[model samples]
Target: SNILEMTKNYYDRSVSPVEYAYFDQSQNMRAINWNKIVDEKDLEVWNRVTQNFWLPENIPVSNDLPSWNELDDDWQQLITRTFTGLTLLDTVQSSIGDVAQIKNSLTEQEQVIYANFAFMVGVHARSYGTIFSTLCTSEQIEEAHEWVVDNEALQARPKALIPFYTADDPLKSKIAAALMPGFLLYGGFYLPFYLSARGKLPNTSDIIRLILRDKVIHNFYSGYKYQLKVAKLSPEKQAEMKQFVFDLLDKMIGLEKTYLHQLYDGFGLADEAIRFSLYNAGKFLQNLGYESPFTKEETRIAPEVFAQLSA
Candidate 1:
């Protein structure tokens, strides 16, 4: 707030001593700035990408309807189970993305992007309905939904943030958790899932491709948001912050790996998924502008799977 301004906005209209429309104070009396956007390019990406939105209905899950069951019934069932798990991740975001957005004071522009993000997450979550309904018996779809609900390991992402998001917690704690599995859940796991499923499930993969496209833009913000906040901490806090990033990543990535192992181990895909998690974990660190936290051995995806995505 400008020193010249004194405005109260609890909307009590009793006009309290509060000044400025936004409660104008930070640790340095300037946190949560609604003024200038620090990530203009990120704002631009959100604006441009969101302008071209698509619904799950647009997926034409029918395109894969006949071919789906024919391709691999067991694997189709596996993928649907996997997709619902992915859907649950989005369901969590649709429900509580605001936890991350409001974790800090947001500029109007940032809020706009965050709002769009949550909306998109909802759209993504509902999308699985079309996929499941198209490919399976209603009862099968019912069981799939049941699996998503009963899915404890797949619920790991939400559970990780519960302590931070549910109750009051330090801002730094929430920011770190927000970016932890959030980015990797999309980029590392889901995108690669689409890559692996591309030829086999064209229609489903196309929907995922669209979701992945949105995630590319989302990554710009998720990756940078935590970095920006951590940079503002005291030296000791910064050290603590760095440790927090790794500690959280280590713990959450373990559960994620466990989830993948239970799902993909029989197929030899679990090894690849673990490597992919490490691969994206490294990318998250780089996006945070840090050296990779992963070992050289830990940071590899299978060449065949690597070939599925861009080099």
Candidate 2:
């Protein structure tokens, strides 16, 4: 309904159906439709293309990447503190969609269509988790963990441990706490579903393709913004950010492995399929020319860090 409303609004503003059709056609060409191809080998070619793509390489270390060990103590503390705050912000932002009710209002047919669309999204989000997990390794996690543990004063800030509780539901604290983590996790997986389905289906399938294109653009802008922000930091600050990013990556990778192992532990994902997904995610980043903030020479971590995590 909202999709129709929005499309009507666009048409009312003098946007031609022919122009929209062209836009849709362009997007369809780029959409990852594993079903429509005639050449079985095309999959192989795509797999190869996606697998070799790397984002960290495009990122310039001098401008965007940082080494945590070299930062001033105060700056390091500030970065760590900011990182903690940001993580919480990420959690809250992620949870908003999960709690929203609009998605449940669609008709049964719409729901079925949406459900299939949701599956594609799940795959994308899983890919994102894998990237984070692969790039961030144990050493980085340990560095951040140590910082959190060592800085008792910082950790004790009222903002740091502000538990999500309210008096109206005081007695249900345990239930709410138990539900919150899963709710946030659901948000991560749901992003692709919402994003992929935006402007598609019902009256026209073209909207689906348009949504995918929008997602690609969205990813590019966000990734570039992050790269630029990291690039502009001082050397010491850069080091700290790099270390922090590495730590976040390690944690994400571990979580992804655990999830995949549980989800496909018995039948198992084909080695090639897993590899392809990792490659695809990397390709998504590479297509935008996203690079690591640190250089190969600057990084203490191995280049294989990306490959090994995917494996």
Candidate 3:
């Protein structure tokens, strides 16, 4: 009984720990065995989650081809323009996983797990490419996708997150503050969860649904990794963390609003889009065990509501 109780402090107090060291972090060389696991039950669950996979190629761009073209040119250009930005978002989303592995030094099983997240993020990026192939000419894809590099607000998405990739200063808080708005904006563009409210079908909606499902579980596990450790800090320290998080959220949301307004100026959905994303960002913050700092925007179902409701 004493031995069983003593094992609780083993990770820190053991002194003779087993792990793979990075020289910077004092780690013990851990084995790919049942004795130690990086994330409690993730090794098994990630396998189960991956089993539901389908070919991203088959994920439709829209329900009807003729209706797609029957629509006005601006509408068609709208779809191509909106989703191309998201492909860039997906690119960064997947890239973050690779950065995590190098900086965090995940275990063998954990590495396999995060690798799958990166893989799925890449698949989502590809599905967008496939969606574009059906919607636009080869050159058209470039017109929408290439210019993303020049957009300062879109560029802000990755820039906000670059620092934490190498330096580990309260990473969990940074993840929520920097990533929540970017993720919500990206989701609003590509993975908008309230598909029932939109006017036209996203053809990629079904595929994106699957992609978002994987991301949800991935965030859960990621938050799980940090919540307990973060909870151990002093309440005074935790309160201080709240201000920093709120400040970051304010800044990132402002950055996203600039980008959304750029995309939505003629569309009238800027306020609605920012609101939708802000609300969702709050939820993302809750997932990380933080209080949401802003109010959510109300619904503004887009033009295709009649067409999009069923899809």
Candidate 4:
């Protein structure tokens, strides 16, 4: 098909005869027509995503300076690593994760949606930088950046996960992309939301809440996209993919448990953080339209923390 050529000739071809507005004879995609959409759900999701647009600079992270100053060395280390760890994942999401979506796009509308998703993920990564610059000294910020590279679990994440994003298989890519926002980030968010629930660092947690809002949609929409693809697969293939999904989730969830232990074990929050990981893992399954492997109790998130997140 000559889709690339059609896009290039779009301006001049309007006056010329065309086979179709959406696709030509060979099924090459022509100019995307908003009036005739392939999926109305993309438009609905697109509106919600675009309408929630925000920037890091607009958030008043400076108000958290007092809370930042109040934390002891150990507490400071836990929260700093939380921000840095999440920033690393967002870096992947913005750069490689959603870029795959554009490459694997089934429709132009979904491609447009992924473009918006990637940009907002970039915003999330930068918001972490904003929080650091606003509250931490240069030396501490630099140390945290170095620590992110040196940490065992943090360094291992991209290595274990990046293959899926880079894979030729579109469903694998979509499943992996959804996992970051859907499952992994929620564990890191527990620290900030925990603090926010206790009336600490209200403004910084405000930014986290906003990011969570965007991510909730990202996870759901990506999961829906994945389901749509999986539905078209043969029964045997679908079963194989289900096994792959569960195995991948188990690996990542174990890694996250180790990471949470490293960050929160000494502080007595490791248990709760691990539980949150399970809760979000269940969410990942739910979004993908599968029954969760975990027990109901295992997937119960904290009410107070979830309250702030929902707010």
Candidate 5:
């Protein structure tokens, strides 16, 4: 099925492109149709995604300059570094994570949806640049960019994920892509969400919220596809996959704990970050159709912060 072939040319009236189903292994060529849908859910997702189209240029990052000016040096370093770390992850998603899945896509609609996901990721990455240019000095922005590569914890993330992103297996790539937004990125997002909860950086937090909105859609749709693929497997294979996902969670959470310590330890926010991480971990598991390994108490972020997650 991974083999490639050319479809009939326009001159060939014998072949009908409209006859192709959304997902048919026997079909040699792909043609997209909105009116005649094979998977109704894909159409719904496409509608939802297209309706929320946004660009970083639309946000007024300059409005947050005064708030940026008020922050002390330590606080300034924390926020800038947090966003810089996020930029790395977003860049990876746009370049490799989503691109890999599209290559292995099962349906034309899914491919279109994943392409949109990749573009939004590029938008999210550019949004970080918008914030940096507006709120920080040129020197500060330069240092933050350099530090993203230099930071051991930040670099460890993409390094670990590279194998999966480059893997031939679509399921492996989808699992990593789903977890990227669903579980890992929330640690970086917690800073903006926390600040916005306390009425700190309203406009800046809005940018993060916008990016978070896209990630929510990205994680859910990708997870939905993963669940559909998993459903076709035998019970033994399903159990094996379940264990694989859980073990992956264990490894990722362990690294995230270390990353948290490096970024927030002794700053009075480390414990809170771990709590938020667990909450996201629960959601990520549920996204993939698995029960959370965490308890209610372990996954509860501050109620105030939770309230601002969608705002």
Candidate 6:
């Protein structure tokens, strides 16, 4: 059946907000009780073990550091792997907002439920945001933020309004049009609705927890798969990827800085926080067994892809 029909069926079985509250209470209690099972040192050890792949000392951020444009094959691949790995991180983080809004729409109540499932999804989004902030330099973080915010209007504009697609360019415009719909229809609508409906009429509390679990797993795989893909590119191609990543980083940082300043009227973030976040992101990439683009050896792409500008 179509979405409208399905939604009406769902509303028929939906419980009162009070009943939903009981399930929410039980879930929180379980989480809290589970926490009591582990001591501080145990938690520390778990974190260290999970994050042991990160090695901050190995990363490099100096202009003097080798770049893809100047590096040999082996070094270039290493750098590319790092750069592409991070690129994947950027892409996933950027797309996360769409998923977040989907989750929000699913759980929104008459009153805001700050302590409920919506809050949990927000927490996950913030975790990524915090990581992005830490992994990027003050400049890089600012740039990424700006790229997202400034491009919002352009990104949201309808392709049908842009009338200049020649036959050759038609596919490109079509593909762009398809991207958002594909994301929403498949991920936002189909998966969540299917899973929720497939189970015996899940209360709001169960649905939220399930979505959160799926999202965390999704984040982990996106990071992992990205690292794997970058690791396999040729040395020269890797260098090219590095340059692309660095250029993107430059753009992202400039835009984000402007956005943040407008929102908070200043740098808002301390320099150390920026450095730490950038380092952490680097570490996260490394933890997955990938080298860092900014820290590792350089790689170079084909001359055609790296041609100099005339003006």
* Winner by lDDT: 4
How many collisions per candidate? 1, 23, 13, 0, 0, 20
Those runs of model 1 whose alpha carbons end farther than 4 Å from true positions after fitting are 1-39, 173-198, 295-297, 302-304
| Alpha-carbon lDDT of model 1 | 0.64
Predicted candidate 5 versus true structure: per-residue lDDT over 65-173, tens digit per residue: 7777888888888888889898999999998888777756656578788889989999999998888888887877888888888888778877877799876666778
Q: How big is the positional error of residue 193 in model 1, measured in Å on the Cα after superposition?
A: 4.1
RMSD of 4: 5.7
lDDT of 3 by residue, 94-161 (tens): 77644454334234565566677677777877877777767677777887877687887878866776
Mark the regions of model 2 whose C-alpha exceeds 4 Å error after superposition. 1-212, 280-311
Model 5 C-alpha lDDT versus the unseen true structure = 0.83
Tens digits of per-residue lDDT, candidate 6, 41-146, equal 3333334333432222232323223222243544333222222222333243334322222221122321122122233333433433433333334554555445
Off by over 4 Å in 3: 1-21, 24-28, 34-39, 101-108, 170-182, 190-199, 296-311
Q: What lDDT score is found at residue 129 in candidate 4?
A: 90
TM-score of each: 0.79, 0.29, 0.78, 0.90, 0.90, 0.27
Candidate lDDT scores, in order, read 0.64, 0.32, 0.60, 0.85, 0.83, 0.32
Per-residue CA lDDT of model 1 for 20-62, tens digit only, reads 4334443222234335566676567666767869988877878
Candidate 2: residue 276 Cα off by (Å): 3.3
1 or 6: which has the higher lDDT?
A: 1
